[PDB]
From a paper:
Gamma delta (γδ) T cells, a unique T cell subgroup, are crucial in various immune responses and immunopathology. The γδ TCR is a heterodimer comprising TCRγ and TCRδ chains, discovered in the mid 1980s9–12. Each TCRγ or TCRδ contains an extracellular domain (ECD) with a Vγ/Cγ or Vδ/Cδ domain, a membrane-proximal connecting peptide (CP), a transmembrane (TM) helix and a short cytoplasmic tail. After antigen engagement, the γδ TCR–CD3 complex triggers the phosphorylation of ITAMs within the cytoplasmic tails of CD3 subunits, initiating downstream events.
Thus, we tentatively assigned cholesterol molecules into the densities at the lower cleft. These cholesterol-like molecules are buttressed by a number of bulky residues, exemplified by Phe283, Phe290 and Phe291 in TCRδ2 and Tyr295 in TCRγ9 at the lower cleft. To investigate the role of the cholesterol-like molecule, we introduced a number of structure-guided mutations into TCRγ9 or TCRδ2 and evaluated their functional consequences using our cell-based assay. However, we successfully identified two strains of Jurkat cells—one carrying F283A, F290A and F291A in TCRδ2 (AAA); and the other carrying the TM of TCRα (Ile254–Ser273) replacing the TM (Met273–Leu292) in TCRδ2 (TMα). These strains exhibited comparable levels of TCR expression to those of WT Vγ9Vδ2 Jurkat cells. After stimulation by APCs, the Jurkat cells expressing the AAA and TMα TCRs displayed significantly lower and higher CD69 expression, respectively, compared with those expressing wild-type (WT) TCRs. Compared with the WT complex, the AAA complex displayed elevated cholesterol levels, whereas the TMα complex exhibited reduced levels. Considering the functional properties of these two mutants in T cell activation, we propose that cholesterol bound to the Vγ9Vδ2 TCR–CD3 complex exerts an inhibitory effect on TCR signalling. By comparing the structures of three Vγ9Vδ2 TCR–CD3 variants, we observed distinct conformations in the TM helix of CD3ζ. Concurrent with the absence of cholesterol, the proximal C terminus of the CD3ζ TMD undergoes a lateral shift of 3 Å from AAA to TMα complexes.
Author numbering:
A (entry chain m): 258 to 291
B (entry chain e): 33 to 153
C (entry chain n): 271 to 307
D (entry chain g): 26 to 138
E (entry chain d): 22 to 126
F (entry chain b): 27 to 56
G (entry chain a): 26 to 54
H (entry chain f): 33 to 69, 74 to 154
The structure:
């Protein structure tokens, strides 16, 4: 059970990363359009 | 009165008892001497601390007792029962011990974002 | 529980794929930005 | 026994697998995958492998003072990478691929310069 | 005295020939039957310094037995390979976001 | 009863966020 | 033992962002 | 020499005895004869239906008929936990899905980029 809760933390980290990178892409695309 | 302390970090486990602060202390585990053998690097004592490397759930998990010289094996009236299922480099954290760090990271990211946004103005 | 492990390891790979898509999109747009400037 | 010394420790809840071969002698040499892999000393008789979640495999061998013994080829399938695609996992992956591709394509479309 | 810490399928028990007195730690769930005590489930990690009296052969003397349990199930087996990469790439991601904000303005 | 309701709720929320961001950035440009 | 709770954690955070951006849009619509 | 080969697909555990193909061979599981009434019964091929982690798991030794088994080559230990239609992702499968994902993303973005200039 010490490894089931490790993937449940890596998934949180990956979702956090995706939420950051989608904002990065959105902001840079908004800049590029201008 | 006299308390007991035990610290488990990853795999190694360290025990200590302050019952006899003025005398270095020998130990037992189900009536066998484990304190002082100048071998078996998996174990080994100190002035007060005793370290048990490669701790196992099904073995050396019993009635530990700390006793100095001039003390009968049954002379000590304070015992301990330990059952630890340890693994290699594993700790304990609940939901509120990861919520705080995730919120801290979000807050610091927002703070840096606002700092760099105001800097352009 | 086994079901929790199944769902968790299902979501991990999907989010990794989405992250890879985002990274490749960022590479494309940063190449475009460098070309523009 | 019939000349089969190597066994596997059972009745354990800790996530670890061990070995056991009985040879009433001293310097009971150990082996793994046929080739020489180690030794054995006093106060311990059980070679260890680690967590079963890493799926130990391969042929294992032990030898006391007798000749070449016979193996105990061990197979484990603690999956731990166990995506279940039956009715609500392939559809989710398909939807997450399709909508992400569409949202990427719209953004690429809206780059004209 | 060695107080037998009896273990059920998933529950632990403290057994002494005379009523058990709790001093420091967890008092658990006291069974209505005398001379028995249900600390709790084996997975909740009970602990605490207790005290009972003499057994069926060794009356009129009293001692204590500290009880400790670390049968953790909320534990996490984290490796420095993935947990460090996550932090490093999160740092690079927030640096990228900060750089992107400057471009917006 | 909620093995995948987590990610099902998360998926819709991301979509709504992206859609509402798309409209917002438009008005900002004016 | 930890997964179901961490669901609502990230699900709520993005919901806050969505609501905040909705308010920002409705103040400029 | 020859190890013991096992292949599992969902709840269908398949293993064979790649020791004596042309022969007659029987089975046990933890020193208990297994086969014939489910359970697969071939001279080398065998199937575990309804495999369980804690009730079919032990020493699979495979003897020819008429030969007591303690003289065989060796044994097997199997502690497989089964699924209901789940896939084991090795290092190859994740790599191939990642490669096809990035290829299908690139080949679809570069199509609309050419369409952007129209
Ligand atoms: C995976 C994601 C990040 C891909 C990109 C999706 C989002 C961020 C894209 C798709 C449509 C885009 C919008 C399309 C049109 C306009 C109008 C223009 O005058 C300003 C930029 C603006 C408002 C764009 C901002 C970025 C945008 C909202």
């Amino acid at each position: 059970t010490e490894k089931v809760n490790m993937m449940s933390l890596t998934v949180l980290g990956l979702r956090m990363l995706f939420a950051k990178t989608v904002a990065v892409n959105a902001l840079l695309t908004a800049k590029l359009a201008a | 009165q006299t308390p007991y302390k035990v610290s488990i970090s990853g795999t190694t486990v360290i025990l200590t008892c302050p019952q006899y602060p003025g005398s270095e202390i020998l130990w037992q585990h189900n009536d066998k001497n484990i304190g002082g053998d100048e071998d078996d690097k998996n174990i080994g004592s100190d002035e007060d601390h005793l370290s048990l490397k490669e701790f196992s759930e099904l073995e050396q998990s019993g009635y530990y007792v700390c006793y100095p010289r001039g003390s009968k094996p049954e002379d000590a009236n304070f015992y301990l029962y330990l059952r630890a299922r340890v693994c290699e480099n594993c700790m304990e954290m609940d939901v509120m011990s990861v919520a705080t760090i995730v919120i801290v990271d979000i807050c610091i990211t927002g703070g840096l974002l606002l700092l760099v946004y105001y800097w352009s103005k | 529980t086994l079901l929790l492990q199944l769902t968790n390891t299902s979501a991990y790979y999907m989010y990794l794929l989405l992250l890879l898509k985002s990274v490749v999109y960022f590479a494309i747009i940063t190449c475009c930005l460098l070309r523009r400037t | 026994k019939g000349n089969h010394l190597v066994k596997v420790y059972d009745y354990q809840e800790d996530g670890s697998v061990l070995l056991t071969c009985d040879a009433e002698a001293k310097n009971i040499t150990w082996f793994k995958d046929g080739k020489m892999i180690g030794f054995l000393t006093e106060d311990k008789k059980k070679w260890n492998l680690g967590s079963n979640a890493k799926d130990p495999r391969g042929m294992y061998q032990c030898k006391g003072s007798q000749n070449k013994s016979k193996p105990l080829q061990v197979y484990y399938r603690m999956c731990q990478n166990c995506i279940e695609l039956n009715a609500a996992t392939i559809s989710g992956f398909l939807f997450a691929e399709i909508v992400s591709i569409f949202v990427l394509a719209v953004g690429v479309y809206f780059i004209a310069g | 005295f060695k107080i037998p810490i009896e273990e059920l399928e998933d529950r632990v028990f403290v057994n002494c020939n005379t009523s058990i007195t709790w001093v420091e730690g967890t008092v658990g769930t006291l069974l209505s039957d005398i001379t028995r005590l249900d600390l709790g489930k084996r997975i909740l990690d009970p602990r605490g310094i207790y005290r009972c009296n003499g057994t069926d052969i060794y009356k009129d003397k009293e001692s204590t037995v500290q009880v400790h349990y670390r049968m953790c199930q909320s534990c996490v087996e984290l490796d420095p390979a993935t947990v460090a990469g996550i932090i490093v790439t999160d740092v690079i991601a927030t640096l990228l976001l900060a750089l992107g904000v400057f471009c917006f303005a | 009863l909620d093995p995948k309701l987590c990610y099902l709720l998360d998926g819709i929320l991301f979509i709504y966020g992206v859609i509402l961001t798309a409209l917002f950035l438009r008005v900002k440009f004016s």
